[PDB]
Symmetry: D2
Subunit: 225 residues, 4 copies
């Protein structure tokens, strides 16, 4: 079995143009966003970065968020969870090839509780791999064949993925997938991205707050989204 | 228990020429709209080497004006496609999709193309699917003793049939075919691409007839365009 | 001078699949949209009375925020009597396809000036002078590839110069354009364009565009909001 | 009137933070290192046959896995670009833009961008700046008249904005604008392919050649396949076999 890991692997380096009479108390993506917004009116003379970013989002000028981007390397995510994930446009993805073969399985969050459920699951995964080898043997009598014999692998099979999005795309991913209407695995992932995103871009994600349900899981909601 | 691939064309363009523009052409529908949009850039309504619709469309493409193709679109309803093939399919930007919900439970499996002529493999596959389903019901019962179903769904194989409405403009279809109807493409997605092509060539020959379909010695078809 | 004209030139042609056990009291885009939404759950029999009409189903789709299903249907307009600066603001919207009157090829009067003959005459005279300048530059610049001259000479043409455009989008993209551009915060020319598109869209797809209400302001200009 | 030269400033690029737990290192940082990491993550190919970042990137290009290039991005602040050239630029999707507001009118004098084909001719340049001055004069005449005509209408703040919006109807194509443009490597490669060619008009061709210069510096392997050649007219073009 494999646990969810979300690692932040890239963010924006910001290099302020020396000839613009403007400065700010921020660096990186948060600084770039303010610069871009101010560029629209050449308003170089909401006087803190935080307050400027707060204002931008109140006034609904969200396109300025698109200039700054963040990438994560995500492991311990199920095939079915990634299928939901890649439905989002305005992200770029690089995913582990289906042709690749180590059985690593991701336990659904509702089942992580239980030894019997967990055992039923890994057993089923072992049975699938056994079938995979049987299908491959008879089939090859070659590289595409390998991919095609993975017809038998379960939804819970682990995959790994590099995801990159601008701040605007991340905020929409979190608004959609960290709600009660989303399944628990992608919601779990969405809350973990938000956590890491707030560490690098607090001002950008300040409007999201996390509510821990009685049900046990966490949800994220914003008045702007 | 096994579901064959079926691709059904469900939508295309209804073109309505504006009366106030001094132009007609030997075409209707999507191909007529594409010519209209191309002509709009220069107001070349009165049109002599590109004065037919098919000639005009070929020229647009020869000269690399592919954005004019974006105005016309086609939708398919696709059944008998594996969950795993659809995962490859939805990596394509510039399409719109509506997919059979994860939370749907009929067991129906799609046979990988290279396993279709093999009775032994067909049987190993369908028995596998029966075992996964048995396991689904065992997990689900024990889990209850929406979320429970989402959790039990963890054991369902990649070969499980899904169903999808896919909508794309001609430019998007042309790129999908180029990419997915080649040698290097996975067999299930390649078969889908050649089926889509066949039907697209039927409704809009001037846009899609530049694709040459050839059979490989292995039995599968490939499409290539100059 | 050139007045605004918006002509609907293309819309979706829907072909229901005969092998699917479903009909609806609509056709074209609204029918395609309903089919796509229903395909997600295979809800072909229409068990719910509230959504057993096309309008009812579409209303529910949007209440429930399933806006991605609107992406399947599209509408194209041909737009004339639109200034260069207004089209610049239009083409900022992504998820649209455009074909615009070429740069290698009449003024539109600002709506707040339309009733004032003195103001209109100041503008047309300025446009006349600019056009004189363009001719003087064009001649001096020429003194095939000698279309480099026209590219350079256009430097003097004003914002108010008319352009022409074919715009295609799906219903989801149109709804967003209207919501952003039909509000008071947008300048009057793009707002006027958004309201006219809304009118024509609500005529073809009422259930999809009904929630937009058009109100009039104190200057005799219109706004729309959902 | 005053004339603005083209200035393209790189204001942002990718910062790459290697995950400590992955058994891999490379001889690069930033965007190029991220692209390699993402390409290797597809196959978990952390260890090498053995005996460079630039070699891996060429491999990625040569196998046509261009989607891996989408992970790294660069942003430029561009000034001294005409409103017409920016109209052409923003047609490109897969970029994000923030542009000087259509409203903005420079307080001190008109700023215009001379078409490159006119750069070497004092008479042509004078006709253009004279035209630009006459448009500004018309602008101020229209604005004052509009503000007068709107004197009794409600919301005087709104009326000022609307007066400005209508009056700018006369401003020419050559008017200077400024823009922040952000794209991933894949989007930049296509912008260069399309706009650094013979077909492209000279003002946008100039811009694309300059973006290329600065892109080639930050990521040489990603942009190496483009070759710049000068035409008989003294103008540069970039082509790639890819
Ligand atoms: N191991 C895996 O399973 C794996 C992992 C990662 C990626 N992938 C691949 O990713 C592919 C997606 O297909 P595709 O990208 O060729 O075509 P696509 O998504 O259909 O998009 C068509 C074209 O639009 C452009 N484009 C789309 N999104 C862009 C973006 N975000 N930034 C810059 N340009 C963008 C590219 O054009 P131009 O470059 O010509 O301008 C692209 O060729 C799949 O075929 C899949 O094979 C696979
Ligand atoms: N079985 C199912 O439950 C099922 C089936 C199919 C799809 N889906 C849903 O599809 C969703 C994908 O997310 P999403 O589309 O909200 O956000 P998204 O893909 O992350 O895209 C972000 C935004 O870009 C705009 N957009 C993207 N592509 C567009 C297009 N082709 N035409 C017009 N506008 C476009 C929309 O903005 P605006 O509209 O605000 O302008 C959208 O909200 C998932 O949330 C998933 O739940 C579910
Ligand atoms: N007369 C005029 O002034 C005029 C009028 C209209 C348009 N245009 C032209 O339109 C061009 C836009 O550039 P471009 O589209 O080639 O590159 P682009 O916008 O930079 O997009 C890059 C690639 O993404 C794909 N793509 C983007 N949006 C798409 C969509 N809606 N549907 C299908 N594919 C899409 C295409 O790839 P693939 O096809 O390879 O899959 C395209 O080559 C401008 O360069 C301009 O010259 C000019
Ligand atoms: N000086 C100026 O006034 C100035 C300068 C530059 C730009 N702009 C603005 O840029 C605007 C463009 O409109 P728009 O972006 O609202 O809608 P859009 O281009 O029509 O696209 C529709 C939706 O798709 C999503 N989207 C599109 N491209 C995206 C991307 N690259 N990254 C992440 N998400 C993306 C956003 O949805 P979600 O956030 O809901 O997910 C957006 O609301 C214009 O309205 C203009 O006001 C203004
Ligand atoms: K977004
Ligand atoms: K495409
Ligand atoms: K949209
Ligand atoms: K691109």
């Amino acid at each position: 079995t494999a646990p969810l890991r979300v690692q932040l692997i890239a963010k924006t380096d910001f290099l302020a143009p020396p000839d613009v009479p403007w400065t700010t108390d921020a660096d990186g993506g948060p600084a770039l966003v303010e610069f871009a917004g101010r560029a629209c009116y050449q308003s170089w003379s909401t006087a803190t970065n935080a307050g400027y970013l707060r204002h931008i989002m109140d006034v609904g000028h969200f396109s300025v968020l698109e200039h700054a981007s963040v990438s994560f390397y995500i492991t311990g995510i199920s095939r079915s969870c990634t299928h939901e994930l890649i439905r989002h446009r305005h992200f770029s993805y690089s995913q582990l090839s289906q042709r690749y073969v180590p059985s690593r399985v991701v336990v659904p969050p509702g089942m992580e509780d239980d030894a019997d459920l967990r055992h039923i699951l890994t057993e089923a995964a072992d049975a699938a791999r056994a079938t995979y080898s049987e299908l491959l043997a008879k089939l090859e009598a070659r590289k595409q064949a390998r991919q095609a014999a993975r017809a038998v692998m379960p939804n819970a099979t682990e995959t790994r993925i590099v995801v990159t999005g601008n701040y605007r795309a991340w905020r929409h991913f979190i608004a959609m997938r960290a709600s009660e209407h989303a399944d628990v695995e992608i919601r779990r992932l969405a809350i973990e991205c938000l956590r890491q995103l707030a560490a690098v871009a607090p001002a950008v994600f300040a409007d999201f707050e996390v509510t821990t349900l009685a049900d046990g899981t966490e949800v994220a909601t914003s008045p702007l989204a």
